């Protein structure tokens, strides 16, 4: 079943691609040559990001294709399918979008979380180990679900820190204890 | 003083804890913004978004949940946090509403200093059963003759007030509200009635005047002004009449009864085309959403006179609904004339005929109730409705150069004179005692010889010779409710002292 | 984005998995989703147009919309037992009705 | 009363504006900076009681 | 019990979505339970759009759901009580007793849909209801086992029309009665609920001729759709299993017609014209077929109808207009005229006025009298312009009997004792026909017009000509 | 740093910009693109998220490569104000576009800004004279008030305007604002000679007008938020200066008509005849900052340019809503050649009372409402038969009536270069006593002609005599 559905549309073709593949039991090696495959389409960088955006026909777009699995043999065949569908439904400007779907469930896969701790300065090495640290001696990070820390600059919030990973948030910044504050005095 | 005050307020903020749920903001404009997270959520919950906006929430969709701002959308900007309140729209409801005017959320916006409320409650409440009812037994009379005698206004009931805009329309609403100064002024608690006037998309101006009208009449001291004025946001005008209806509720609970007037209940439904043709909801009908018909329909039926079990507790409601073009066949208009137990139609040629109030009472029913208004003044008006019809269908028939026969005529010298009787002017409510005589007199075709110029002076005249000598016989009305023999006769004697003099 | 039944994911992750067509298009159809009695069905290639196909539920229906994705079948009875991925024989006659 | 009470609001209003100036005063300040350390820790205590 | 659990997907008013897990899907037209401090929500499964996603409608309020919330799937359409523990209790949309009459069933339930009886099951009738509505009788009888039709528009009484009917023939009628009502207000509920309790058809100590399923317009769009379903279900059940004369009562159609004009848009149906569904002549036609006299059980329906705006060209009062056996239109002029009845006899037709269904005498009584307040009605132009002046001696004759006749029709209701004063008079059918013969032939046009007014038979006719005399 | 961007779409004055930089746009910014044709004002009107703004464009789009540089100027367009208002006319932007040069200012204010509190709020009622006789017969303004006009297609909307700015504003000291949204150009430079001729604006002197004029020509955003910007400038008077001010817009239809022009592109889907759906907030906001608050009194007279004729429309009904006095004038009454052309059934005051103007006035009142009722009710029976045929006692109503509407016409000073009918200003206290005189019937013997285009009743009674000649 689904690693929980991501968006819609574009990534219910990555749910698809991985769900396939996950049953196939081959998900890192299709990642991986994603990314491989990836990179070669943006170290094409004159019509491999100017022949992302359609402009010829399905059989020329076809044959793009198969120039880009000229480029690397394997490619897994669930994404040499994946380009199938993808010239079929001619659309490849949403295939570095779809990769980046596929990215996101490859990595829900793994379990690594993504998080940040959104500051409006650039905050110590201490402050960054504390806190992914305390984040994994919660339950917020589930262990086997790891986690990466971006800090942030954001002068919008002014001063104080926001820490923030899933659904879940503590806001302990300046700027929204002074909006409260400010409220409670404009009574 | 104000230092200690301030101390207080500074002193009363203090700590917090890790909040629950966030989503980051994305397409937002026009006042309906979309936010991507917030897996839990409450259907119609309030969500606080960083800019300070708090928004109920109309959409949730596997994609992006959809939040209702009731701020401005300037405070709002792009991949805001917004961090979810955890509570389902709710009012503060309590004792301390009364002499307030308060804005939807309830906050006082005549500043006499915060709320002292009791309670907070939900916005949408769903009406009361079969189960909880007793049937009308008790009179509420707005102290227009007209209205009192020909369309009587009984508690609980919803009773539709109809026709064009600002034509008085407020007006007839704020006469009802000065003669429930009456009772108000009187004691016994069920006897009284408060009162909660809802305004909603009208100006500030109107609405300032309209409560300083009521603190000119000094009416203020047992009103709830529940008030969204015609800048404030459609989605708080939306959720308007929901929370001066829980507030109501308040009061029906308590087992009090009180009146709730939603003016403009049009307004709501303008307000609700908006917020659904921004929440891009297929529109219905004329573009109001069709399920407009089902939120004015729960909104209605919330008022009621309960069972003498549940406290008998009556919210009494009077819907108002502008009539643009006078044509009632627009889809709102329709909609509420089903919803409601009574229609109350006002016609403008009948203003401009001098006739004020303009209220055509050949399209004014009420449709449920008869034990809704006073006894003695049913007795009375009997045959002043036949008389009316009557009076309705000869001065038809006397169109189109009909020479008409002496019966017709007396038909009609009769009804013209009631036409005259009718007539109140604005904020003058009269005391129920003295509309008896009055009709009595019409009926009796006391004032058919009576010229017509000087019906006004008999009017006012024989008033005050009914104050002058049968005082008496004003107190017994008061007392008893229904004319006994001694009091048609007295009522009688005296009509005919003053038809001379 | 365009809608085919390239967006639908249980057709989709069998495209995917190299998995398609081969008389299951042919007349042969699948229901991918029936509401409203307008079944859509992916395949009936073969369909003549507002032709005669009956369902696995039984029931029958004409081909009034010959969609470029799917087949819009008109339901000739309630939706009551019909439900997805519903295999659609197709009857092949064209609407006829004996006469005599 | 009235222009008492009008009185009480003009000076809450007034000493209102002191607090906004106020505000001006404490955001200059690299207690900016300090305060921060003081939320960097009181998150570590928040968090580890979660 | 089978795991088919579905986790919301959308709460979007009444369409919730459901998300079903992968093998699982339910079938269009199943019921959904939801657990939740609301008791169960309950959603009707309409559509599926394929991936595992159904788009139900709700039955109940959708405030205060959670997206992405596990829904258990109790299948096919809502099984409703069955029974002759069925009668005399009010019961929910759902079935809940709304009257704390405990647990309702008696050892069966049914579905809510049923399937209309075939062309092979239809057995013809030609019955004749007397309702001792002297307009009725004369002008438009009714047939038991019929699919009588109470066109009329907003607030023509239209439920004191009925508790006339319910008064007298209910009571007077073996057959067990379903009194429903689709979207109507709880201040009639309360009413009609005393009402009937003290008309004693609902017993509170022995059995009751009658049930309740009070759906209030209170209650969400998509269950007042579903009252109807409920309603008829209940009626089928007597008609069918237990053989049993029925006299179903429902109200107000128009409700229903537009409950499903609402969840049209929302189930995203593009609207048709005046905004209906476009699925209205076979939503109606799904309602109108099921209700018929077959070889089972006589269903003598009596369905209420609300014209909108009294605009009977528009779509749903017409297509209505169709379906129902022995129409009947009261309209606003005629109560304006002050006659209760309010109906309007030269637009109220019947299949079953005929001069062979009630005999050539009946029919000849009531062709002489529609010919007279036709002429009436005709001449009313004349009057008003011309006067009376060119106008027939004859023809004055026949516009002073048109107006005796008018007021004849004028007879108060006994349930409008408290809607007026006079009590009702049902009149004999027989008695009827030979009271109106006589004011043809002119037997009685030395009686004062005012004499006919708000009265019962010749009797009283000639006892309030007495009493105006004095 | 410079929040730069590209313009990623240009689908009519609803260009989009793509802002690069993850710096956050607001809504309600401004946003210079600068052109060859100097710098166009763009203002942030919906965030489509991904940094990527939709914005409404104020002057002309033509020209515009998609891919063009953006410059976020922050916040909405900021007008100059100041005494330095008073005698110019300006711009959108605030540039003199009388080209009088550079406006010295000292407070430079955002466009939007919010509706003064509930508590703010203060009414009075101090009867305005206008000096037009059916104005002031028939619903009197009063100071602080807003008033209505609910003139037909090119009735001139303007002309009773024009009147009323000369007469009331010329007796008013205090500041004025003139705000013209989509008027035709030509008018408005007759308008703007006339201010300088009669001294209204005396720009070697000092103006006590100001004056925002918005050609019908210009792009329909720049109109949409020409409102807004006359708005700012009538707050500087009411607050900052203190100053009572007075208000003239026409017409508050082009802005509703406006909004109806870009809300489509803007991605609405749009209510009925068309109308914005967001129709009721944008009027709201507008009317509501307009209003006699403690800190000024600022009577405002608002023109409505009914649209089609058709006054049930959404535009004019909302209108209605937010105004103390209404004077609907229509094509009929212009056409039967009545001028002014205001409706006499369809006029409406707040500030008619008999606590107002009085229970004398009231009662005069009450009485030309009952003539002219009854006499719209024999319109039918006068056209089916003769006139003769009406019955005797109606018949001397009707020919009152007759009088009364001739009556009402007054020639106006403005008018007067255009009908060639010297101007006539008749006093509030010479109206009452005219009226109540052919209310009595007293000059009800002369014709109908002599009450016809004339003045005060010793007018009719000395046109009698001419007429008699």
């Given at each position: 079943?689904?690693?929980?559905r991501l968006?819609?549309?574009?990534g219910?073709?990555?749910?698809?691609?991985y769900?396939?593949?996950?049953?196939?039991?081959?998900?890192?090696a299709?990642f991986?040559?994603?990314?491989?495959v990836?990179?070669?389409?943006?170290k094409?960088?004159?019509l491999?990001?100017?022949?992302?955006?359609?402009?010829?026909?399905?059989?020329?777009?076809?044959?793009?294709?198969?120039?880009?699995?000229?480029?690397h043999?394997?490619?897994?065949?669930?994404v040499?399918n994946?380009?199938?569908?993808?010239?079929?439904?001619?659309?490849?400007?949403?295939?570095?979008?779809?990769?980046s779907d596929?990215?996101?469930?490859?990595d829900?896969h793994?379990?690594?979380?993504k998080?940040?701790?959104?500051?409006?300065?650039?905050?110590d090495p201490?402050?960054?180990?504390?806190?992914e640290?305390?984040?994994?001696?919660?339950?917020?990070?589930?262990?086997?679900?790891?986690?990466?820390?971006?800090?942030?600059?954001?002068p919008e919030?002014?001063?104080?820190?926001?820490?923030?990973?899933?659904?879940?948030?503590?806001?302990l910044?300046?700027?929204?204890?002074?909006?409260?504050?400010?409220?409670?005095?404009?009574? | 003083?104000?230092?200690?005050?301030?101390?207080?307020?500074?002193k009363?903020?203090?700590?917090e804890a890790?909040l629950?749920?966030?989503g980051?903001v994305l397409?937002?404009?026009?006042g309906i913004?979309?936010?991507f997270?917030?897996?839990?959520?409450?259907?119609?919950?309030?969500?606080?978004?960083?800019?300070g906006?708090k928004?109920?929430?109309?959409?949730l969709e596997?994609?992006?949940?959809?939040?209702?701002?009731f701020?401005?959308d300037?405070?709002?900007?792009?991949?805001?946090?917004?961090?979810?309140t955890?509570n389902?729209?709710?009012?503060?409801?309590?004792?301390?509403?009364?002499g307030?005017?308060?804005d939807?959320?309830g906050?006082?916006?005549?500043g006499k200093?915060?709320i002292?409320?009791?309670?907070?409650?939900?916005?949408?409440?769903?009406?009361?059963?079969?189960?909880?009812?007793?049937?009308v037994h008790?009179?509420?009379?707005?102290?227009?003759?007209?209205?009192?005698?020909?369309?009587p206004i009984?508690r609980?009931?919803r009773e539709?007030?109809?026709?064009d805009?600002?034509?008085?329309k407020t007006?007839?609403a704020?006469?009802?509200?000065l003669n429930?100064?009456?009772w108000?002024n009187?004691?016994d608690?069920?006897?009284?009635l408060?009162?909660?006037?809802?305004?909603?998309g009208?100006?500030?101006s109107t609405?300032?005047?309209?409560?300083?009208?009521?603190?000119?009449?000094?009416?203020?001291?047992?009103s709830?002004?529940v008030?969204?004025?015609?800048?404030?946001a459609?989605?708080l005008?939306?959720?308007?009449?929901?929370?001066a209806?829980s507030?109501g509720?308040?009061?029906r609970?308590?087992?009090?009864?009180?009146?709730?007037?939603?003016?403009?209940?049009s307004?709501q439904?303008?307000?609700?085309?908006?917020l659904?043709?921004?929440?891009?909801?297929?529109?219905?009908?004329?573009?109001?959403?069709?399920?407009?018909f089902?939120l004015?329909?729960?909104?209605?039926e919330?008022?009621?006179?309960?069972?003498?079990?549940?406290?008998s507790g009556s919210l009494?409601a009077?819907?108002?609904?502008?009539?643009?073009?006078?044509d009632?066949?627009?889809?709102?208009?329709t909609?509420?004339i089903?919803?409601?137990?009574?229609q109350?139609?006002?016609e403008a040629?009948?203003?401009?005929?001098?006739?004020?109030?303009?209220?055509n009472?050949?399209?004014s029913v009420?449709?449920?109730?008869?034990?809704?208004?006073?006894?003695?003044?049913?007795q009375?008006?009997?045959?002043?409705?036949?008389?009316?019809?009557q009076?309705?269908?000869?001065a038809?028939?006397a169109?189109?150069?009909?020479?008409?026969?002496?019966?017709?005529?007396?038909?009609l010298?009769?009804?013209?004179?009631?036409?005259?009787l009718?007539?109140?002017?604005?904020?003058?409510?009269?005391?129920?005692?003295?509309?008896?005589?009055l009709?009595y007199?019409?009926?009796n075709?006391?004032?058919?010889?009576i010229?017509?110029?000087?019906?006004?002076?008999?009017?006012?005249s024989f008033?005050?010779?009914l104050?002058?000598?049968?005082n008496?016989?004003?107190?017994?009305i008061?007392?008893?409710?229904?004319?006994?023999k001694?009091?048609?006769?007295?009522?009688?004697?005296?009509?005919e002292?003053?038809?001379?003099? | 984005?365009?809608a085919?039944?390239?967006?639908?994911?249980?057709?989709?992750?069998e495209?995917?998995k190299g998995?398609?067509?081969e008389a299951?298009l042919?007349?042969?159809?699948?229901?991918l989703?029936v509401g409203?009695?307008?079944?859509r069905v992916?395949?009936?290639?073969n369909?003549?147009?507002?032709?005669?196909?009956?369902?696995?539920?039984?029931?029958?229906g004409?081909?009034?919309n010959?969609?470029?994705?799917?087949?819009?079948i008109?339901?000739?009875?309630?939706?009551?037992?019909?439900k997805?991925?519903?295999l659609?024989?197709?009857?092949?006659?064209?609407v006829?009705?004996?006469?005599? | 009363?009235?222009?008492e009470?009008?009185?009480?609001?003009?000076?809450?209003?007034?000493?209102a504006?002191?607090?906004?100036?106020?505000?001006?005063?404490?955001?200059?300040?690299?207690?900016?900076?300090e305060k921060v350390?003081?939320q960097?820790?009181?998150?570590?205590?928040?968090?580890?009681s979660? | 019990?089978?795991?088919?659990?579905?986790?919301?997907?959308?709460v979007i008013?009444?369409?919730?979505?459901?998300?079903?897990?992968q093998?699982?899907?339910?079938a269009?037209?199943?019921?959904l339970?939801?657990?939740?401090?609301?008791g169960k929500?309950?959603?009707?499964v309409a559509?599926?759009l394929?991936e595992?996603?159904?788009?139900?409608?709700?039955?109940?309020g959708?405030e205060?759901?959670?997206?992405?919330?596990?829904?258990?799937?109790?299948?096919?359409?809502?099984?409703?009580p069955?029974g002759?523990?069925?009668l005399?209790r009010?019961?929910?949309?759902?079935?809940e007793?709304?009257?704390?009459?405990?647990?309702?069933?008696?050892?069966l339930?049914?579905?809510?849909?049923?399937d209309?009886?075939?062309?092979?099951?239809?057995?013809?009738?030609?019955?004749?209801?007397?309702?001792?509505?002297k307009?009725?009788?004369?002008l438009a009888?009714?047939?038991?086992?019929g699919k009588?039709?109470?066109?009329?528009g907003?607030?023509?009484?239209?439920?004191?029309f009925?508790?006339?009917?319910?008064?007298?023939?209910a009571?007077?009628?073996?057959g067990?009665?379903v009194?429903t009502?689709?979207?109507?207000?709880?201040?009639?509920?309360?009413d009609?609920y005393?009402?009937?309790?003290?008309?004693?058809?609902?017993?509170?100590?022995?059995?009751?001729?009658?049930?309740?399923?009070?759906?209030?317009?209170?209650?969400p769009?998509?269950?007042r759709?579903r009252?109807a379903?409920?309603?008829?279900?209940?009626?089928?059940?007597?008609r069918?299993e237990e053989?049993?004369?029925?006299?179903?009562?429902?109200?107000?159609?128009?409700?229903?017609?537009?409950?499903?004009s609402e969840?049209?848009?929302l189930?995203?149906?593009?609207?048709?014209?005046?905004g209906?569904?476009?699925?209205?002549?076979?939503?109606?036609?799904?309602?109108?077929?099921?209700?018929?006299?077959?070889?089972?059980?006589?269903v003598?329906?009596?369905?209420?109808?609300?014209?909108?705006?009294?605009?009977?060209?528009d779509?749903?009062?017409?297509?209505?207009?169709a379906?129902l056996?022995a129409?009947?239109?009261?309209?606003?002029?005629?109560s304006?005229?002050?006659?209760?009845?309010?109906?309007?006899?030269?637009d109220?037709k019947?299949?079953?006025?005929?001069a062979?269904?009630?005999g050539?005498?009946?029919?000849?009584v009531?062709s002489?009298?529609?010919?007279?307040?036709?002429?009436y009605?005709?001449?009313?132009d004349?009057?008003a312009?011309?006067?009376?002046?060119?106008?027939?001696?004859?023809?004055?004759?026949?516009?002073?009997?048109?107006?005796?006749?008018?007021?004849?029709?004028?007879?108060?209701?006994?349930?409008?004792?408290?809607?007026?004063?006079?009590?009702?008079?049902?009149?004999?059918?027989?008695?009827?026909?030979?009271?109106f013969?006589?004011?043809?032939?002119?037997k009685?046009?030395?009686?004062p017009?005012?004499?006919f007014?708000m009265?019962?038979?010749?009797?009283?006719?000639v006892?309030?000509?007495?009493?105006?005399?004095?």
């Amino acid at each position: 079943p689904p690693p929980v559905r991501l968006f819609g549309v574009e990534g219910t073709y990555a749910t698809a691609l991985y769900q396939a593949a996950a049953k196939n039991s081959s998900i890192d090696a299709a990642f991986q040559s994603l990314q491989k495959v990836e990179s070669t389409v943006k170290k094409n960088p004159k019509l491999g990001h100017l022949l992302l955006n359609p402009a010829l026909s399905l059989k020329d777009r076809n044959s793009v294709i198969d120039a880009i699995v000229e480029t690397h043999k394997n490619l897994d065949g669930y994404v040499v399918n994946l380009l199938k569908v993808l010239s079929e439904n001619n659309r490849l400007g949403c295939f570095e979008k779809i990769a980046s779907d596929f990215g996101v469930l490859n990595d829900a896969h793994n379990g690594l979380l993504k998080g940040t701790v959104t500051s409006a300065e650039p905050l110590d090495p201490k402050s960054f180990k504390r806190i992914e640290k305390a984040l994994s001696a919660s339950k917020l990070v589930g262990q086997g679900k790891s986690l990466k820390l971006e800090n942030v600059v954001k002068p919008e919030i002014k001063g104080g820190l926001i820490v923030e990973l899933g659904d879940k948030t503590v806001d302990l910044s300046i700027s929204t204890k002074i909006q409260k504050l400010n409220k409670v005095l404009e009574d | 003083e104000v230092s200690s005050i301030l101390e207080e307020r500074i002193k009363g903020v203090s700590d917090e804890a890790n909040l629950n749920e966030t989503g980051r903001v994305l397409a937002v404009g026009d006042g309906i913004a979309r936010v991507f997270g917030l897996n839990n959520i409450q259907a119609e919950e309030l969500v606080e978004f960083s800019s300070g906006v708090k928004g109920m929430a109309l959409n949730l969709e596997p994609g992006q949940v959809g939040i209702v701002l009731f701020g401005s959308d300037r405070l709002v900007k792009e991949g805001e946090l917004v961090k979810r309140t955890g509570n389902i729209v709710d009012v503060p409801v309590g004792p301390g509403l009364l002499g307030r005017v308060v804005d939807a959320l309830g906050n006082p916006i005549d500043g006499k200093g915060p709320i002292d409320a009791a309670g907070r409650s939900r916005a949408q409440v769903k009406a009361p059963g079969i189960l909880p009812r007793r049937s009308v037994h008790e009179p509420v009379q707005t102290g227009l003759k007209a209205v009192d005698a020909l369309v009587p206004i009984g508690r609980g009931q919803r009773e539709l007030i109809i026709g064009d805009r600002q034509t008085g329309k407020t007006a007839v609403a704020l006469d009802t509200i000065l003669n429930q100064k009456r009772w108000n002024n009187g004691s016994d608690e069920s006897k009284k009635l408060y009162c909660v006037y809802v305004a909603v998309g009208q100006k500030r101006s109107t609405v300032a005047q309209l409560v300083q009208t009521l603190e000119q009449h000094d009416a203020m001291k047992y009103s709830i002004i529940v008030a969204a004025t015609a800048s404030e946001a459609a989605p708080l005008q939306y959720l308007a009449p929901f929370t001066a209806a829980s507030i109501g509720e308040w009061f029906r609970d308590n087992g009090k009864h009180a009146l709730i007037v939603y003016d403009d209940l049009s307004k709501q439904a303008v307000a609700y085309r908006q917020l659904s043709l921004l929440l891009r909801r297929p529109p219905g009908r004329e573009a109001y959403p069709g399920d407009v018909f089902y939120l004015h329909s729960r909104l209605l039926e919330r008022a009621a006179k309960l069972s003498e079990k549940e406290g008998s507790g009556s919210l009494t409601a009077l819907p108002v609904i502008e009539t643009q073009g006078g044509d009632v066949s627009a889809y709102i208009p329709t909609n509420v004339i089903s919803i409601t137990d009574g229609q109350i139609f006002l016609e403008a040629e009948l203003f401009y005929k001098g006739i004020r109030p303009a209220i055509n009472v050949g399209l004014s029913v009420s449709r449920v109730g008869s034990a809704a208004q006073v006894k003695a003044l049913k007795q009375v008006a009997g045959s002043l409705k036949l008389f009316l019809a009557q009076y309705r269908e000869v001065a038809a028939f006397a169109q189109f150069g009909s020479d008409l026969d002496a019966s017709t005529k007396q038909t009609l010298v009769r009804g013209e004179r009631l036409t005259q009787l009718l007539k109140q002017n604005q904020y003058s409510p009269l005391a129920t005692e003295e509309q008896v005589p009055l009709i009595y007199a019409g009926v009796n075709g006391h004032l058919d010889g009576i010229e017509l110029s000087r019906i006004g002076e008999f009017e006012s005249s024989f008033l005050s010779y009914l104050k002058s000598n049968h005082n008496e016989l004003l107190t017994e009305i008061r007392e008893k409710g229904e004319l006994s023999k001694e009091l048609l006769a007295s009522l009688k004697s005296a009509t005919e002292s003053f038809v001379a003099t | 984005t365009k809608a085919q039944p390239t967006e639908v994911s249980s057709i989709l992750e069998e495209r995917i998995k190299g998995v398609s067509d081969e008389a299951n298009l042919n007349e042969t159809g699948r229901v991918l989703a029936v509401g409203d009695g307008i079944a859509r069905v992916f395949g009936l290639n073969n369909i003549q147009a507002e032709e005669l196909v009956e369902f696995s539920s039984g029931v029958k229906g004409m081909a009034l919309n010959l969609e470029p994705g799917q087949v819009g079948i008109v339901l000739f009875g309630s939706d009551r037992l019909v439900k997805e991925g519903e295999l659609v024989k197709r009857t092949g006659n064209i609407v006829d009705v004996p006469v005599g | 009363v009235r222009y008492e009470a009008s009185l009480r609001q003009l000076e809450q209003r007034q000493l209102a504006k002191s607090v906004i100036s106020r505000v001006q005063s404490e955001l200059g300040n690299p207690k900016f900076q300090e305060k921060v350390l003081q939320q960097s820790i009181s998150e570590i205590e928040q968090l580890l009681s979660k | 019990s089978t795991p088919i659990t579905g986790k919301v997907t959308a709460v979007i008013g009444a369409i919730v979505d459901v998300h079903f897990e992968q093998s699982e899907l339910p079938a269009i037209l199943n019921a959904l339970e939801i657990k939740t401090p609301q008791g169960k929500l309950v959603l009707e499964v309409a559509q599926h759009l394929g991936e595992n996603t159904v788009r139900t409608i709700a039955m109940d309020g959708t405030e205060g759901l959670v997206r992405g919330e596990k829904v258990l799937d109790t299948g096919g359409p809502i099984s409703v009580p069955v029974g002759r523990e069925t009668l005399g209790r009010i019961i929910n949309v759902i079935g809940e007793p709304i009257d704390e009459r405990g647990p309702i069933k008696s050892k069966l339930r049914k579905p809510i849909h049923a399937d209309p009886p075939s062309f092979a099951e239809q057995s013809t009738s030609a019955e004749i209801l007397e309702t001792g509505i002297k307009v009725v009788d004369l002008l438009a009888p009714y047939a038991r086992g019929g699919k009588i039709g109470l066109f009329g528009g907003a607030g023509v009484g239209k439920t004191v029309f009925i508790q006339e009917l319910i008064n007298n023939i209910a009571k007077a009628h073996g057959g067990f009665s379903v009194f429903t009502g689709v979207g109507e207000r709880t201040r009639e509920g309360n009413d009609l609920y005393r009402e009937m309790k003290e008309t004693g058809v609902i017993n509170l100590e022995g059995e009751s001729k009658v049930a309740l399923v009070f759906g209030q317009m209170n209650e969400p769009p998509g269950a007042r759709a579903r009252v109807a379903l409920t309603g008829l279900t209940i009626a089928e059940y007597f008609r069918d299993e237990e053989g049993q004369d029925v006299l179903l009562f429902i109200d107000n159609i128009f409700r229903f017609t537009q409950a499903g004009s609402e969840v049209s848009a929302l189930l995203g149906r593009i609207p048709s014209a005046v905004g209906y569904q476009p699925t209205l002549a076979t939503d109606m036609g799904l309602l109108q077929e099921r209700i018929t006299t077959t070889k089972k059980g006589s269903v003598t329906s009596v369905q209420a109808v609300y014209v909108p705006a009294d605009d009977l060209t528009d779509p749903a009062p017409a297509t209505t207009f169709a379906h129902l056996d022995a129409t009947t239109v009261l309209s606003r002029g005629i109560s304006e005229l002050g006659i209760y009845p309010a109906v309007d006899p030269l637009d109220s037709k019947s299949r079953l006025l005929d001069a062979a269904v009630v005999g050539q005498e009946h029919y000849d009584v009531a062709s002489k009298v529609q010919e007279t307040l036709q002429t009436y009605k005709s001449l009313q132009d004349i009057i008003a312009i011309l006067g009376m002046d060119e106008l027939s001696e004859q023809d004055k004759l026949t516009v002073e009997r048109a107006r005796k006749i008018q007021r004849f029709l004028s007879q108060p209701f006994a349930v409008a004792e408290v809607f007026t004063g006079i009590p009702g008079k049902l009149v004999r059918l027989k008695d009827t026909v030979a009271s109106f013969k006589a004011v043809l032939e002119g037997k009685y046009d030395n009686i004062p017009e005012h004499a006919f007014y708000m009265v019962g038979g010749i009797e009283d006719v000639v006892a309030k000509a007495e009493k105006l005399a004095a």
